[PDB]
Write a protein that binds this ligand. Structure first.
Ligand SMILES: CC(C)CN(C[C@@H](O)[C@H](Cc1ccccc1)NC(=O)O[C@H]1CO[C@H]2OCC[C@H]21)S(=O)(=O)c1ccc(C(N)=O)cc1
Lengths: 99, 99
């Protein structure tokens, strides 16, 4: 669709068998999800933002369904205050910024 | 313009007489710039980023030139990893996200 930015661009996603709301975020290189269970091996990272850094687990090749579209990519899991869909998945949707 | 998301959507802005690089950030409610000096009075504000809450200076009705367009609105100034243009100004650009 065409999503305006008058409000937060929040969409419903399905990941790890769980349904949740997440923010379409052009300012995020990668997708970052609030603490949840995911299968497989992971690697520790530190990612930085406005309040400083948060410790996350990096999972690779995680399928996520976003607005009825199945995409796959890197997901970072940790104590983020909100679920963020980053550029690494938005590209798979063919999502662009337009003005 | 149409901006794909394979790379960071960075643009040059002109603000307070200076040129700066800034990130078009749909995950940001607000526009947040690194320490700067802007005219007029400021008001206290606390914002919550990925790492926690941060004190910033809120300046109102600041003109910024972005991609050839003049926007005028609220600018928060404080410790940020990068200058971010949030939805408050992107709406003035007429920015939308599209599939
Ligand atoms: C600040 C930018 C440069 C990076 N951040 C993405 C932003 O869009 C970040 C996303 C977000 C984090 C926490 C709560 C709500 C939204 N937004 C963000 O910090 O916005 C600030 C300014 O306006 C306010 O509205 C929402 C929170 C406040 S990030 O910190 O969340 C981030 C950092 C690293 C990565 C990564 N390494 O992939 C991904 C995301």
């Amino acid at each position: 669709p065409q999503i305006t930015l008058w409000q937060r661009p929040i969409v419903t996603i399905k990941v790890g068998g769980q349904l949740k709301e997440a923010l379409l975020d052009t300012g995020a290189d990668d997708t970052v999800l609030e603490d949840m269970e995911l299968p497989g091996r992971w690697k520790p990272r530190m990612i930085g933002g406005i309040g400083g850094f948060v410790k996350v687990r990096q999972y690779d090749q995680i399928p996520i369904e976003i607005c009825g579209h199945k995409v796959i990519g890197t997901v970072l899991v940790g104590p983020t205050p909100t679920n963020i869909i980053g550029r690494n998945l938005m590209t798979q949707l063919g999502c662009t910024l337009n003005f």
